[PDB]
C-alpha cells in the first residue's frame, strides 16, 4: 500500500491500543470494586453468623 | 499488500475500532450499575448491623 | 507483500471481528442478567426494611 | 512491507485470535457462574420471604 | 509500504498482544474472586436456612 494509507492505519491502531489500555485500567478498577463488595459481604456473613448463634 | 485490498482492511479495522468504543461504553455503564448495587448492599449491611446490635 | 497471504489475514481479521461481536453480545446479555439480579436484590432489601421496622 | 515481516505479523495475529477466543470462552464460563449465583439469590429471596411471612 | 513503518506497527501490535494477555489474566483472577464470592453466598444461604428452620 501507499505510505499515506499505511500511516493512517498505524495511527488508527495506536488509537485502539490507547483505548484498550484505558479499558484494561477500567476493568481493574471494577475488579477493585468487586473485591470491596466481596469483603463487605464477608463482614455481613460474619455479623449474621454472630446474630444467628445468639438467637438460635 | 496492494491498495484496494489494504483500503478494505483499513476500513474493516476502523469499524472494529468503533465497535470497541461501544463495548468500552457498555462496560462503563455496567461498572456504574455494579457500584450502585455495591452501595445498596453496603446500605443493607449497615441496616442489618443496626437491627442485630441496637435492637437485639 | 503477497496479495494471497494478505487475503488470508483479511479473512482471519473477519473471523476475529465476528468473534468480537459475539463477545460484545455476550457481555450485553450478562448486563441483562446483572440487572435481573440487582432488581432481585432490591426486592430483598425492601422486604428486609419492612421486616426490621416491624421487629425493631 | 517484505513478505517476511508480514508473515511474522500474520502468525502473531493468529496467536492473538486464539487468545481472544480463549478469553471469550472464559467470559462465557463466568456468565454460567453468574447465572448460577443469580438463581441461588432468587432462592434465598423466596426463603427470606417465607420466613418473614410465617413470622408476622 | 515501507519496512520502517511496518516495524513500528509490528512493535505496537506486540505491545497490544502483551496487554491483552495481562487483561486475560486479570479476567481469570476476577473469575476466581467471583467464584469465591458465590461460595461465600452459598455458605450464608445455608446459615440462613438453619436459622429460619429454628423459628418455625
Q: Is E15 on the interface with A (CB under 8 A)?
A: yes
Cell of E54: 429454628
CB of C45 closer than 8 Å to CB of B40: yes
Q: Which three cell numbers stand for residue E36?
A: 469465591
Distance separating the N- and C-terminal Cα atoms of chain E = 79
H-only helix segments in chain C: 3-55
Q: At a CB cut-off of 8 Å and minimum separation 6, what does C29 contact?
A: D31
Tell me which residue of C4, E16, A21 sits closest to E8, measured CA to CA.
E16
| Closest-CA residue to D31 (of C6, C23, E24) | C23
Give the residue extent of every domain in chain A.
1-56
A46–chain E nearest CA distance, Å: 9
Burial class for A39, CB neighbours closer than 10 Å (0-12, 13-18, 19+)? exposed
State the structure-solving technique: X-ray
Q: Report the C-alpha gap between E19 and A24 in whole angstroms.
A: 8
**CA E11 – CA E6 distance, rounded (Å):** 9
DSSP B55: -
Topology classification of domain B1-56:
1.20.5
CB B41 within 8 A of CB A41: yes
* Distance from the B55 Cα atom to the nearest Cα atom in chain C, whole angstroms: 6
Cβ–Cβ contacts within 10 Å for residue B53, how many?
11
From the list E12, D42, A40, E28, the residue with the least C-alpha distance to B13 is E12
Distance from CA of B1 to the nearest CA of A (A): 6
Q: Please tell me if residue A56 touches chain B, with a CB cutoff of 8 Å.
A: no
Q: State the best of D51, D52, D54 to mutate against chain E, taking most chain E CBs within 10 Å.
A: D51
Exposed / middle / buried, residue B8 (Cβ in 10 Å: 0-12, 13-18, 19+): exposed
Q: Distance between CA D36 and CA D49 in Å, rounded? A: 20
- From residue D31, alpha-carbon distances to C8, C23, D38, E16 in Å are 32, 11, 10, 26
Distances (CA, A) of C28 to A14, A51, C20, C31, C42: 26, 39, 12, 5, 21
Amino acid at each position: 500500500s501507499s505510505n499515506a494509507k499505511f500511516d493512517q492505519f498505524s495511527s488508527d491502531f495506536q488509537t485502539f491500543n490507547a483505548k484498550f489500555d484505558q479499558f484494561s485500567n477500567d476493568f481493574n478498577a471494577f475488579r477493585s470494586d468487586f473485591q470491596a463488595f466481596k469483603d463487605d459481604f464477608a463482614r455481613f456473613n460474619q455479623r449474621f453468623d454472630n446474630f444467628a448463634t445468639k438467637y438460635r
